[PDB]
C-alpha cells in the first residue's frame, strides 16, 4: 500500500550502501518519518537498512 | 611609519586581568598565566551550563522520590500514573509543590495511583 519509515539509529559507523540508502528514502536524523509507496524498490531499500529503521503499515 | 606597539597591546591585557580577580597565585597577577586559566574558565562554564540542566533534574527527582515514598509509592510508578492521567506537570514544579505544599502533593499521588493499571506486572 503505502509505508511509513522511522529512523531509529544513526548513520555513524554505517557503510556506504546504508548511508546512501537512507538518503534515497528521504531520512535525515533520528526519529524522522517519511511516507513512501510500497513498490518493489522501497522494500529493497528497507532490507539493506532494516537494522536502522522501523517500518510499519501506516496510512 | 614606526608604530610603538604598546597602546594596542595593553587593551587585551587589562580585560584578561579584570576577569582574573579572585584567582590565587600567579593566575591573578600575571598576563601569561591568566590567559591560560581563562581558556579553562570558559570551557568549564560552557561544559557546566549544559551539565546543570541534568544536575537540577537529578535533584528534583530525588525530592520527588523522597516525597513519593511518604505516600507509599515509588518514583517508578508516580511518573507512570501521571502520564496515564494526562498531568503534564514538569519535574521542577512537581518537586516545588512537594516542599511548599504537601497536601497538594498527596492529591497528585492519589490521582496517579488510581489511574495506574490494576496489575502493573501483567502485560498490556
Amino acid at each position: 500500500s503505502q509505508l511509513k519509515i522511522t529512523q531509529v539509529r544513526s548513520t555513524i559507523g554505517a557503510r556506504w550502501k546504508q548511508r546512501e540508502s537512507l538518503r534515497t528514502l528521504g531520512l535525515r536524523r533520528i526519529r524522522h518519518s517519511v511516507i513512501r509507496e510500497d513498490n518493489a524498490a522501497t522494500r529493497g531499500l528497507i532490507a539493506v537498512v532494516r537494522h536502522l529503521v522501523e517500518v510499519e503499515p501506516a496510512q | 611609519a614606526r608604530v610603538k606597539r604598546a597602546v594596542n597591546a595593553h587593551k587585551k591585557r587589562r580585560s584578561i586581568l579584570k576577569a582574573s580577580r579572585g584567582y590565587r597565585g600567579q593566575r591573578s597577577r600575571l598576563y601569561r598565566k591568566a590567559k591560560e586559566q581563562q581558556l579553562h574558565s570558559l570551557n568549564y562554564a560552557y561544559r557546566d551550563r549544559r551539565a546543570r540542566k541534568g544536575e537540577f533534574r537529578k535533584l528534583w527527582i530525588a525530592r520527588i522520590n523522597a516525597a513519593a515514598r511518604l505516600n507509599d509509592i515509588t518514583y517508578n510508578r508516580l511518573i507512570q500514573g501521571l502520564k496515564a492521567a494526562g498531568v503534564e506537570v514538569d519535574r521542577k514544579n512537581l518537586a516545588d509543590i512537594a516542599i511548599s505544599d504537601p497536601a497538594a502533593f498527596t492529591a497528585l499521588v492519589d490521582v496517579a495511583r488510581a489511574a495506574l493499571p490494576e496489575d502493573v506486572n501483567a502485560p498490556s
Binding site: - | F56, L59, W60, A62, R63, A66, A67, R69, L70, D72, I73, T74, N76, R77, K92, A95, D96, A98, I99, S100, P102, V120
Partner: protein, 146 residues
C-alpha cells in the same frame, strides 16, 4: 529558583534501630539513608540534613556462617609488613559495634561532609542505650510495595 535550604531549617530527630535478626547489608543501607536525609523531601547534597541513628543489639546482627570465618578486615600501619588481618568472627567477640559502624561508613559519600554526618551515629552492643534523655522513636525496616 529551586529550594536551597537555609541554615536553621533542617529539623533533626532521633531514631533507634534494633538489629536482632537484621542482616548487615539491610541495616547499613537503612542507616546511611537515614543519617543523610534522603528520606526527606528537602534534600540537598551539600547540607547535613538527616537525623540521629542509635543502633542497639549489634552483637546479634545476622551474618552468615561462611562470613564469620572467611571475610577479612584489613588495616595497614604504614610500616613494612604491617598488614594485619582479623576475621569478622573475631571482631564480633571483642568489638561488635565496629562491624556495624564500618558497614555504614563505606556507604556514605567519600567527602568532607560525611565526616560531620558520621558524628550523628551511636552504635552499641547490648540492648541498652544511654540516650533516654531524648525520646528515640523506633524505626523498623519497610519496603515500598510496587
Amino acid at each position: 529558583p529551586t529550594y536551597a535550604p537555609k541554615a536553621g531549617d533542617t529539623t533533626r530527630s532521633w531514631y533507634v534501630i534494633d538489629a536482632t535478626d537484621v542482616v548487615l547489608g539491610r541495616l547499613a543501607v537503612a542507616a546511611a539513608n537515614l543519617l543523610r536525609g534522603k528520606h526527606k523531601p528537602t534534600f540537598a547534597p551539600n547540607v547535613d540534613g538527616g537525623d540521629f541513628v542509635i543502633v542497639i543489639n549489634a552483637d546479634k546482627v545476622a551474618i552468615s556462617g561462611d562470613k564469620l570465618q572467611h571475610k577479612m578486615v584489613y588495616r595497614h600501619s604504614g610500616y613494612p609488613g604491617g598488614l594485619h588481618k582479623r576475621t569478622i568472627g573475631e571482631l564480633m567477640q571483642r568489638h561488635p559495634d565496629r562491624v556495624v559502624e564500618k558497614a555504614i561508613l563505606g556507604m556514605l559519600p567519600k567527602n568532607r561532609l560525611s565526616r560531620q554526618i558520621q558524628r550523628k551515629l551511636r552504635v552499641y552492643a547490648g540492648p541498652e542505650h544511654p540516650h533516654s534523655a531524648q525520646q528515640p522513636v523506633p524505626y523498623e525496616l519497610k519496603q515500598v510495595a510496587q
